[PDB]
Symmetry: C2
Subunit: 149 residues, 2 copies
Amino acid sequence: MNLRIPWKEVYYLGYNMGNYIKISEPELLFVLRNKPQIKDRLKLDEKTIIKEGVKKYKNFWEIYYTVKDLILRGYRVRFDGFFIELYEKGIIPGTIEQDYLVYPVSGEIRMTWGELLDIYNKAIARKSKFMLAIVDSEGDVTYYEFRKL
Amino acid sequence: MNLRIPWKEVYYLGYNMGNYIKISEPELLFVLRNKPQIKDRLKLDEKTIIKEGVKKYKNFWEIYYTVKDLILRGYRVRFDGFFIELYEKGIIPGTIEQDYLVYPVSGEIRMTWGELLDIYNKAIARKSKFMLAIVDSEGDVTYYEFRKL
């Protein structure tokens, strides 16, 4: 989960700890499937990482698919353990504050309006804008801003 | 439920049918508690109207409280049976399109992200912006825009 690999070669995902990149399972899962040569220079399987991602995050797949869509669109992101930090194209994460904290979910997973308020409030408590990412059954992602008036 | 009363004296709530105002229970409930003289010129009780409002709308109170907050803030609104149509101050409803379709809920009532998408889509299908109104346990209302990026 700690990659001794230059930050840029893992798309600037995870946290740059200087001597390694501390990276989450869904982010790492993406790196594996897009950098096959790194899959060996590490020799781990996306069966095992998938396996542990699901164990760790109820919304593993939603995180993975949202990271994937965003990185492929050219955005820079970093998973904080709850929110995906979304930065403009060309920005290196941590270098400035993210534009959005994005919360990834799928359409079927349940919620109360009270839960939405809690999530939004957490983003406000970190002084940033809030975005919901909904991943549908084909793994496609749509995005919605939610903001108090 | 049909008031033979000039539109302006019921705050421009309900639908102006020319010879009467077709008004909903939560809107009417508000009129009753703010125009006591009209409560008699009509001689109905907010026990009975409350009673039938709840029978008709699962979110009766949330509608009532949101109408109330908005009308007292000076906005013009009209309940469409699902959304509250929100117009700028000074506007007469129907006269132009509403600025928002607002959907009123309370924090404890359940939801899936799929439900939020459906509600939002209905507002988009009517070509207008979408606002969620959350009424808390003291009847206070907070407002949030939700929009696709």
